[PDB]
């Protein structure tokens, strides 16, 4: 999980609690992915970047890793919560 997207990058820049560039993960996901699929919606915000939707910087198009190892993280978000 923690060693998983830190082994990407979502933890990289998105702690559990604090965040360095972009909003902490706790926080994005109970922003957004704490109501319905927000996981895969956001998902798709995720791959489409974002540039006001916060006020940090402006995140590049990585959606979490590859196929599964990618769908396996969004899922550690949902179970982060
Ligand atoms: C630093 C290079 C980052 C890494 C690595 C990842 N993200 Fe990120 N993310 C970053 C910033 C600076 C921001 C804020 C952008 C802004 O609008 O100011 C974000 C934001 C997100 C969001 C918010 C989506 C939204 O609500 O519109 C998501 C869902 C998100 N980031 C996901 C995400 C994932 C899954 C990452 C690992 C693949 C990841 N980010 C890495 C900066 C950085």
Same mark, same amino acid.
């Given at each position: 999980?923690?060693?998983?997207?830190?082994?990407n990058?979502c933890?990289?820049?998105? !702690?559990?609690?604090?965040?360095?560039?972009?909003?902490?993960?706790?926080?994005? #996901? #109970?922003?957004?992915?704490?109501?319905?699929?927000? #996981?895969?919606?956001?998902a798709?915000?995720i791959?489409?970047?974002?540039?006001?939707?916060?006020? !940090?910087?402006?995140?590049?198009?990585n959606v979490n890793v590859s196929?599964?190892d990618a769908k396996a993280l969004a899922?550690?978000?949902?179970?982060?919560?």
């Amino acid at each position: 999980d923690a060693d998983l997207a830190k082994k990407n990058n979502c933890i990289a820049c998105h !702690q559990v609690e604090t965040k360095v560039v972009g909003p902490a993960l706790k926080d994005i #996901a #109970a922003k957004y992915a704490d109501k319905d699929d927000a #996981a895969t919606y956001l998902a798709g915000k995720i791959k489409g970047g974002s540039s006001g939707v916060w006020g !940090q910087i402006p995140m590049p198009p990585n959606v979490n890793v590859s196929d599964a190892d990618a769908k396996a993280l969004a899922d550690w978000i949902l179970t982060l919560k």
